[PDB]
């Protein structure tokens, strides 16, 4: 029941005193201390990535870049740098790899693909990759976002009430929020890319039909450091499927 | 004025302390004490400018002040000069916007070749004067002038582009507005006209043309078009 | 003084919210009011502008699946008016989204049921095909032409990594970034990507999209067990 | 009567769409716990802070 | 104009009679018909 008890006793049994406490609320403080600096770390990482992007002669906002289609150069460079960042974050060690890599833009629906907006052709003689600029532009059409929101909480007196009592390019945040989109997208691509680069093609018959059990292969594969699944309860209604 | 960032240190108030130095040199530094009444500031500046206008060569001001309030005081001077002109000699007195203009012209020179970063604006002014009449139309420099002054312009003070320039020259039967040739002494544009009849500038036609253009160019974004319109003359 | 005259602002804004929901799928809301739907309708009727859209929608009232015949010029004016009413910045709203919205109401009216409906009819019947194909076939047919396409750049692809070192600059940035409840916020972007999963296609769209999509997050359990061996 | 009936009628939520409840704990004592030894490996940074 | 006065009045009359008399929920009736009802009222 964890109703910790405690005693003091003088030499020669001259006196004995008792008191008691509980480990409760200590756990709450521990949880707060964890989540705080964890969020801090993640935010810091994001900031670093954005600052790295900032070097790249941003005569324009991001949105403009993809809203244009005439260029490919800037897009390719952005994609590449994203891949690099992910790889390094998995490998705390500088890398340059197979020094021949190229991109092609799937500029039309007839070249489009379900789901995965990115496709590595691992070696058609050499690696190539695909980019759906039209879709990417759809995603960045954004305006889904407004921060004025509300969020799940429960049992606050026990669970949360304690949490009640603690505390030029001068661009705004919404754009940065948007970056997370491509962060996640390139991550999801990196999964498949890494897998196939480490293994055969045929497992694409599974993974690309359904990624699914690929985590089983990833067992013992992850470097003992997590990526970008903090709010682990990502889910939607399911039983409604009415198959 | 001139600003470099040799110099004569001129006390910012006492007139005759530097008498005859203001005859001899042309490179005058100025100051002020913190307490100074703005009225006194104006007064001293006026006196200095009068004596300079008596002087035989254009000496150079330099002033060690934050100067935003000095631009305010310049606006005051503008009021003052108008007050005088209510009874005045109608002098062709030189005056300038001192910050917005300033930086703009600096950028202009920078984008051009800069044989003299110290070159006076009036230089460029007259240079365009050389060519205005032959093209009978208004230079963008002069248009941005009377545009980006706080007050004597399109005037962000009150958002008043309505101050369109009607420009006339000797013996003309016609004038040059902000917006093309106009007949003389009339309100800039007839309400009636050979109107921009919608059988041209039909949205549909514009759209079709735009589609054509975008297709051909392979351009995804950044294209907009507008039909031209006409005032008194075509 | 008419019954129409009461709150054009209310009608406009509410209708715009509903429409922006159904079309862009923007944001979570308790987006519902039957009376406001009716207000939307009458707000259409009160302008000759948008009369076309009204008529279109009215065609839906008999629920039948058919897609109306295009008449090109009027459809163009349609697009025009739609973008105008959405006040969106030239955001290239398109016939596909138009049709999806159209079908939205012919989905909604099907229900005479009033209590509530969790139902999320994510699919649309009417997508201009005889029958949905598999995905695999599409994968084949696309990849075929895909391999044809030539490279579009040359990555020099030698030894290159970018970085910058202005620690003070970076921390200034951090402090600029500090306030935002990113935790709360980024859910919106996640949902955006989700909706994009279906926006991807309107052509024999993948029927199943569910369990694997959840296994994505079950990767989190995989990771936690990896961390705990 | 049918006034009140209409009042009861017109509250009728419709056509909702996917939403998500990502908020909750991830971890607890049912997770690896920090060790004073590795915290020594951390704090040894003070043997470079020095000064 | 677009409005089928005939069918509008028909459905409105039927629905109103039914629903006003019964004072209760009825799964039969597509809400569309309610919409037509208010449309008819605003026209008439």
UniProtKB/Swiss-Prot annotation, chain A:
Top-level division of the source organism's lineage: Viruses
Alphabetized UniProt keyword annotations: Host-virus interaction, Membrane, Modulation of host cell cycle by viral cyclin-like protein, Modulation of host cell cycle by virus, Viral envelope protein, Virion
Transmembrane spans: none
GO cellular component: membrane; viral envelope; virion membrane
Pfam families attached to this UniProt entry: Baculo_ODV-E27 (PF05314)
InterPro entries named among the record's database cross-references: Baculo_ODV-E27 (IPR007978)
GO biological process, one term: symbiont-mediated perturbation of host cell cycle progression
Subcellular location, record wording: Virion membrane
Protein's UniProt keywords contain Membrane: yes
Function comment: Acts as a cyclin-like protein and plays a role in the modulation of host cell cycle. May promote G2/S arrest by interacting with host mus209/PCNA, cdc2 and cdk6. The cell cycle arrest is characterized by an intact nuclear envelope, concomitant with sustained activity of host cdc2. However, viral DNA replication still occurs in the arrested cells.
Quaternary structure and interacting proteins, as annotated: Interacts with host mus209/PCNA, cdc2 and cdk6. Forms a complex with proteins C42 and p78/83.
Assigned protein family: Belongs to the baculoviridae E27 family.
Designated name of the protein: Occlusion-derived virus envelope protein E27
Annotated organism of origin: Autographa californica nuclear polyhedrosis virus
Lineage, broadest ranks: Viruses, Viruses incertae sedis, Naldaviricetes, Lefavirales, Baculoviridae
Designated gene of the protein: E27
UniProtKB/Swiss-Prot annotation, chain B:
Species of the source: Autographa californica nuclear polyhedrosis virus (AcMNPV)
Gene that this polypeptide is encoded by: ORF109
Known function: Plays a role in the transport of the budded virion (BV) to the host nucleus and for occlusion of viral progeny.
Name of the protein described by the UniProt record: Protein AC109
Localization annotation: Host cytoplasm; Host nucleus
Taxonomic classification: Viruses, Viruses incertae sedis, Naldaviricetes, Lefavirales, Baculoviridae
Main location: host cell
Keywords linked to the UniProt accession: Host cytoplasm, Host nucleus
KW Thylakoid (keyword) present: no
Positions spanned in the full protein: 131 to 390 of 390
GO process terms (BP): nuclear capsid assembly; transport of viral material towards nucleus
Keyword Lipid metabolism tagged: no
One GO term describing the cellular component: host cell
Curated annotation (Swiss-Prot), chain E:
Coiled-coil ranges (or none): none
Location(s), subcellular: Host nucleus; Virion
Highest taxon of source: Viruses
Family: Belongs to the baculoviridae C42 protein family.
Function (record text): Plays a role in host nuclear actin polymerization by recruiting p78/73 protein that is capable of activating an actin-related protein 2/3 complex to initiate nuclear actin polymerization.
Subunit structure: Forms a complex with proteins E27 and p78/83. The interaction with p78/83 mediates nuclear translocation of P78/83. Interacts with protein Ac102. Interacts with IE0.
Protein name in the entry: Protein C42
Species of the source: Autographa californica nuclear polyhedrosis virus (AcMNPV)
Residues of the full protein shown: 112 to 155 of 361
């Amino acid at each position: 029941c964890n109703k910790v008890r405690t005693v003091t006793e003088i030499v020669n049994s001259d006196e004995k005193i008792q008191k008691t406490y509980e480990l409760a609320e200590f756990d709450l403080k521990n949880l707060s201390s964890l989540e705080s600096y964890e969020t801090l770390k993640i935010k810091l990482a994001l900031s670093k990535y954005m600052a790295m992007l900032s070097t790249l002669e941003m005569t324009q906002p991001l949105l403009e870049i993809f809203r244009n289609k005439a260029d490919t150069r800037q897009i390719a460079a952005v994609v590449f740098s994203t891949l690099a960042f992910i790889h390094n974050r998995f490998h705390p060690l500088v890398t340059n790899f197979t020094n021949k890599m190229e991109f092609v833009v799937t500029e039309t629906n007839d070249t489009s693909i379900p789901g995965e907006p990115i496709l590595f052709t691992e070696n058609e003689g050499v690696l190539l990759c695909s980019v759906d600029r039209p879709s990417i532009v759809k995603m960045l059409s954004r305006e889904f976002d407004t921060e004025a929101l509300v969020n799940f909480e429960n049992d606050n007196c026990n669970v949360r009430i304690a949490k009640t009592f603690g505390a030029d390019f001068s661009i705004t945040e919404v754009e940065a929020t948007q970056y997370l989109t491509l962060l996640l997208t390139v991550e999801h691509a990196y999964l498949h890319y890494y897998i196939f680069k480490n293994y055969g093609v045929f497992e694409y018959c599974k993974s690309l039909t359904d990624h699914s059990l690929f985590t089983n292969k990833l067992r013992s594969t992850m470097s003992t450091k997590t990526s970008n699944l903090l709010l682990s309860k990502f889910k939607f209604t399911i039983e409604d499927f009415d198959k | 004025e001139f600003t470099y960032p040799n110099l004569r240190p001129i006390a910012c108030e006492i007139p005759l302390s530097h008498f005859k130095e203001l005859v001899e040199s042309n490179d005058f530094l100025l100051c002020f004490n913190l307490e100074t009444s703005t009225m006194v500031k104006i007064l001293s500046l006026k006196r200095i400018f009068c004596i300079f206008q008596y002087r035989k060569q254009p000496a150079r001001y330099v002033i060690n002040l934050p100067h935003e309030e000095i631009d305010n005081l310049y606006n005051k001077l503008n009021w003052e000069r108008t007050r005088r002109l209510m009874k005045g000699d109608v002098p062709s007195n030189c005056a300038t916007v001192n910050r917005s203009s300033l930086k703009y012209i600096k950028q202009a020179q920078s984008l051009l070749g800069i044989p003299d970063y110290s070159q006076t604006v009036v230089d460029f002014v007259k240079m365009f004067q050389k060519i205005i009449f032959p093209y009978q139309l208004v230079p963008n420099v002069i248009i941005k002038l009377n545009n980006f002054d706080q007050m004597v312009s399109s005037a962000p003070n009150k958002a008043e582009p309505y101050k369109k320039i009607r420009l006339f020259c000797k013996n003309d039967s016609i004038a040059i507005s902000s917006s093309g040739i106009v007949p003389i002494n009339m309100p800039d544009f007839s309400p009636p006209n050979t109107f921009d009849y919608s059988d041209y500038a039909n949205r549909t036609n514009i759209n079709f043309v735009t589609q054509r253009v975008l297709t051909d160019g392979g351009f995804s974004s950044g294209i907009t078009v507008t039909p031209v319109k006409y005032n008194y003359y075509l | 003084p008419s019954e129409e005259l009461i709150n054009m602002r209310r009608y406009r804004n509410a209708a715009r919210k509903l429409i922006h929901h159904y079309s862009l799928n923007s944001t979570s809301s308790t987006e519902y009011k039957i009376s406001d739907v009716v207000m939307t309708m009458i707000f259409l009727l009160r302008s000759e502008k948008y009369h076309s859209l009204f008529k279109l929608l009215e065609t839906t009232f008999d629920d039948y699946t058919c897609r109306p015949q295009m008449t090109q010029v009027q459809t163009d004016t349609l697009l025009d008016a739609v973008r105008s009413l959405l006040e969106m910045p030239s955001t290239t709203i398109d016939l596909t989204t138009v049709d999806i919205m159209r079908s939205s109401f012919a989905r909604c009216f099907n229900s005479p049921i009033m209590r509530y409906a969790k139902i999320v009819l994510l699919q649309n019947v009417a997508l201009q095909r005889d029958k949905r194909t598999t995905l695999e076939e599409l994968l084949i047919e696309r990849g075929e032409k895909i391999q044809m396409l030539q490279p579009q750049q040359y990555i020099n692809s030698g030894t290159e990594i970018p970085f910058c070192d202005d620690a003070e600059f970076l921390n200034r940035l951090l402090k600029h970034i500090d306030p935002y409840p990113l935790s709360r916020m980024y859910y919106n972007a996640a949902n955006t990507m989700f909706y994009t999963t279906m926006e991807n296609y309107a052509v024999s769209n993948c029927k199943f999209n569910i369990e694997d999509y959840n296994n994505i997050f079950k990767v989190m359990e995989n990771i936690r067990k990896h961390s705990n061996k």
